[PDB]
Amino acid sequence: DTLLGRILPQLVCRLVLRCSID
């Protein structure tokens, strides 16, 4: 989840998944 989920793809992790209560 780092270097590819905490910098660029994180967008689709803390902004998208977070929105849909993941």
Side-chain angles (χ1 to χ4, degrees):
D1 287 348
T2 59
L3 312 182
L4 35 73
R6 212 85 331 191
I7 314 178
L8 343 171
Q10 83 180 101
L11 269 56
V12 296
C13 195
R14 270 77 72 83
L15 313 181
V16 180
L17 286 60
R18 184 180 296 277
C19 181
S20 59
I21 60 170
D22 181 355

